[PDB]
Amino acid sequence: ATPAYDLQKRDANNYLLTVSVPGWKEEELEIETVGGNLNITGKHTEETVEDQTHWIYRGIRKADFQLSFSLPEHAKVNNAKLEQGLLLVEIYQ
Template sequence: MNTRLSLWRPERSISFRDLNNLQRRFDRLWEDVFVPATSEAQTVVDYVPPCDLEETDSHYVVSLDVPGMSKENLHVEVSGENLIITGSRKEERITKKGEPQISERYQGKFFRSMSFPGLTEESKIEAVYKDGVLRVAIPKAPQAKKKAIEIADEKSSFWSKLLGRVEEKRAEKAA
């Protein structure tokens, strides 16, 4: 008899596996809607690691939970305005026989992409992986300083020149 075990928590009426599957479905739906159509995005992903995006005065900071992965299996790149993070973790089993009774750890390939349209300095992006968290710091592009615009009188402005030409053309047509 082959029985699949389920993790039971007395304080919850829904099993952890059900919630985990629901989260995976929402993550895939989210990625399908918001990931740009690139060749990397079209590859099959096995899971989507949880991610936080924070904004400071000078940077955007992306934190991605990928515990148990090696730095060599993580890849961060910039393609146009998109930050693309990919990685993979091989399945680990103690024995080669049978199925695991409970498997909550993610394995396989993942893909995350975020768009930062024209707001970053690509050459200064930094990434660090520590304690199972990949952090990517994306510096914001220097913003143009505010500048007060002097309001000119009508005769010396661009608008008067433009409107004057329009009036001249109307007079020529009328003549």
């Protein structure tokens, strides 16, 4: 199960990342980077005392996943603005 994602290029020294992230909580998330590389981990909050009579249908899997990536020599980041369940990341090379 691979979550949809987006990636755009802007020129040879700039790239643009867009990530689809509807429904995830802040508490479900913790950061990281290891050896000039890049590590990606997802944890979705363990579900609450929410009555399944109240829960009618669950088509959205809200589970967990984990990715780790060597950053090709040598990419760098700049800021993170999050908006409307889509992820926008500015990248200062």
